[PDB]
Design a protein around this ligand. Structure first.
Ligand code: P34
Ligand code: ZN
Length: 200
């Protein structure tokens, strides 16, 4: 029962999401090996994901979490990159910091997983991990963290916790990464279609 509502570029909801994509790009310690070499994206399309089943399932668990955490869901908007975005938007999320589902504040970190682990073999057409041509897709997701276990960084949550926060302890300009272990603690709210852009 998933529908995808296309947002117009002049829509304020389109604009606030593009600005989160763009302003959270960083350099990566692999010099672009996994995700490509770029400072910004070309946003081709932003679609709002509407699914009543999956939404109700998210909100039910969010209420459970907040009740176990002094009425605080600790809800964030985070990026998720995966080859299986198609399954995720229709079926929901299913089952470094464990065997959970990973999310990032840096859009460019999630971009490293679009074609698979460590960027896989790159795009299906050119086998190029820095392809400036093929169309990529990321999810921008509403995620319930509850009480998050702090991990200073370079299955189930820990007892009494609802998620893990990977705090970058060495990396200079990195933002945080997060892990949940219950698929129903995240709702995929926007599907973003884009290309990475070659520096001039
Ligand atoms: C056991 N690991 C090789 C599996 C793994 O790394 N899976 C995986 C799979 C997909 C992932 N997608 C992300 O957007 C992401 C963002 C920040 C950190 C990790 C991820 C991410 C991680
Ligand atoms: Zn390509």
């Amino acid at each position: 029962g998933t529908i995808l509502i296309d947002l117009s570029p002049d829509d304020k909801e389109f604009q606030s999401v593009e600005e989160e994509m763009q302003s959270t790009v960083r350099e990566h310690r692999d010099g672009g090996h996994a995700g490509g070499i770029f400072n910004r994206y070309n946003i081709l399309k932003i679609q709002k994901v509407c699914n009543k089943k999956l939404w109700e399932r998210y909100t039910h668990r969010r209420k459970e979490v907040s009740e176990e955490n002094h009425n605080h869901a600790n809800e964030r908007m985070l990026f998720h990159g995966s080859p299986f975005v198609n399954a995720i938007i229709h079926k929901g999320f299913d089952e470094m910091f464990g065997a959970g589902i990973y999310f990032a504040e840096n859009s460019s970190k999630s971009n490293q997983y679009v074609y698979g682990i460590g960027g896989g073999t790159g795009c299906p057409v050119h086998k190029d991990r820095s392809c400036y041509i093929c169309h990529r897709q990321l999810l921008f997701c509403r995620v319930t963290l509850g009480k998050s276990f702090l991990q200073f960084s370079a299955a189930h949550s820990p007892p009494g916790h609802h998620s893990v926060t990977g705090r970058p302890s060495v990396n200079g300009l990195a933002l945080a990464e997060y892990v949940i272990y219950r698929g129903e603690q995240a709702y995929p709210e926007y599907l973003i279609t884009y290309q990475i852009m070659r520096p001039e």
